[PDB]
Amino acid sequence: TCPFYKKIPGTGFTVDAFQYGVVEGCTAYFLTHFHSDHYAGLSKHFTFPVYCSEITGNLLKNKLHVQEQYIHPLPLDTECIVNGVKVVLLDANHCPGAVMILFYLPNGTVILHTGDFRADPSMERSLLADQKVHMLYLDTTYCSPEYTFPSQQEVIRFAINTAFEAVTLNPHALVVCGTYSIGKEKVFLAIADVLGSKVGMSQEKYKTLQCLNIPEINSLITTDMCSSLVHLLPMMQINFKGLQSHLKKCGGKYNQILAFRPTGWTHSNKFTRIADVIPQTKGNISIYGIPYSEHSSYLEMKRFVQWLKPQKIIPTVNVGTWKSRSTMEKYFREWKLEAGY
Ligand code: NI
CATH class of the missing domain: 3.40.50.12650 (Rossmann fold)
Known part of the structure; x- marks a missing residue:
């Protein structure tokens, strides 16, 4: 079944969750970028709405043969409404068409999902700076100081x-x-x-x-x-x-x-x-x-998170073993104690 780290609380949305068949309650499936781990399970046979960048939509249409009626491309850096909820797509600085998604929940909570990203200081002067972000779903690929x-x-x-x-x-x-x-x-x-x-x-x-x-x-x-x-x-x-x-x-x-x-x-x-x-x-x-x-290198990821000051972090990479999760939690606590949030 679809893990909790691919679900957005208090919506019927999921992110990068195509390998589990029909997800119960899901009204919209988001795809951050066109890499096979993230798209795994999508094909011409999928019949639910997919939200994504224009580039990711071109790829879905032409390479995977997903039918046009199910592709909902959205522009970048623009406030859009999806099924009654305000969203924004931002450049992730990963591969072509890769996005981070900002979700403004009806209760007033704000959630950033990074997808895969390479953190950069230009992200500190985007729409992200305009308000508090409560929860962060984080690309933790290189979350260790040797990287x-x-x-x-x-x-x-x-x-x-x-x-x-x-x-x-x-x-x-x-x-x-x-x-x-x-x-x-x-x-x-x-x-x-x-x-x-x-x-x-x-x-x-x-x-x-x-x-x-x-x-x-x-x-x-x-x-x-x-x-x-x-x-x-x-x-x-x-x-x-x-x-x-x-x-x-x-x-x-x-x-x-x-x-x-x-x-x-x-x-x-x-x-x-x-x-x-x-x-x-x-x-x-x-x-x-x-x-x-x-x-993100360790130093680029740490800078980004210390600027953003999230109240909770949800890792999206290397979550399969308790040892990795435990090690990542230790680094998140250090960062929080150093920066004072
Ligand atoms: Ni990727």
């Missing part, structure tokens, strides 16, 4: 300079970027822009990008692999064997590969800075691991 990472901009700068140098040294080098869902598109778009190239990709991946309301998208991407010097492949193929194999397929148009694996955190965040990063190399193929995150 540090550079800014998105530091990581992009590094990727840009690295790719530019390699292709100026060898104009027959190909650049490859790994991918498994939506998100982290700036990696491959910024590399292609410094090289004066479009991004080449499969038909399925191109169809995904064509849903994302990216300005001038037709000038940035193509299905003609031949004509382009940055290619996208599934993350699973970003290894020496997969990359040599792809290089055979391209028709000796390239004689070297430089590849990027954008990942979350892995244990080497605790010493290395982005400027120290060096690749793994075997022959004419090099692979760089770059920690481009679309989730």
Whole structure:
């Protein structure tokens, strides 16, 4: 059955709750973003109302084949009424079309559901600042102090300079970027822009990008692999064997590969800075691991919550074991005692 952390008290709403069949009492199902864990269970067979951003609606329609009559897209930063209740969608700074939802309950309680998010200080001057928020449903992915990472901009700068140098040294080098869902598109778009190239990709991946309301998208991407010097492949193929194999397929148009694996955190965040990063190399193929995150670091999450001063926090990630819940509760209490709420 649908857990209490996916239910909004004193409404018939749920959030990211599509895997449990019909939820008893639910009149509207919200979807924060188009990642499979969150949408799991949605298909052309679903016949209840779904509320979401415009981008998330394009994806539901075109990729999942959810029928149009059930898609209710809402604009961002706008007070809207849903089934008698005031809501606002806000940018979550996660992947394209990802939202946080603000719910103003009839009794006067205010609830923020973050979805998946990367906390940023620009969120401190949104509509959130206008009133007290009583309850917070929080993306706790990286809720432990070891989880540090550079800014998105530091990581992009590094990727840009690295790719530019390699292709100026060898104009027959190909650049490859790994991918498994939506998100982290700036990696491959910024590399292609410094090289004066479009991004080449499969038909399925191109169809995904064509849903994302990216300005001038037709000038940035193509299905003609031949004509382009940055290619996208599934993350699973970003290894020496997969990359040599792809290089055979391209028709000796390239004689070297430089590849990027954008990942979350892995244990080497605790010493290395982005400027120290060096690749793994075997022959004419090099692979760089770059920690481009679309989730809050511990420090970014702590700042956001200390500003917001919620009366209660409800975790939405790593809630499956008592040890994790216990550890998270300890950090929430520290934050509260330091900030005085
Ligand atoms: Ni996500």
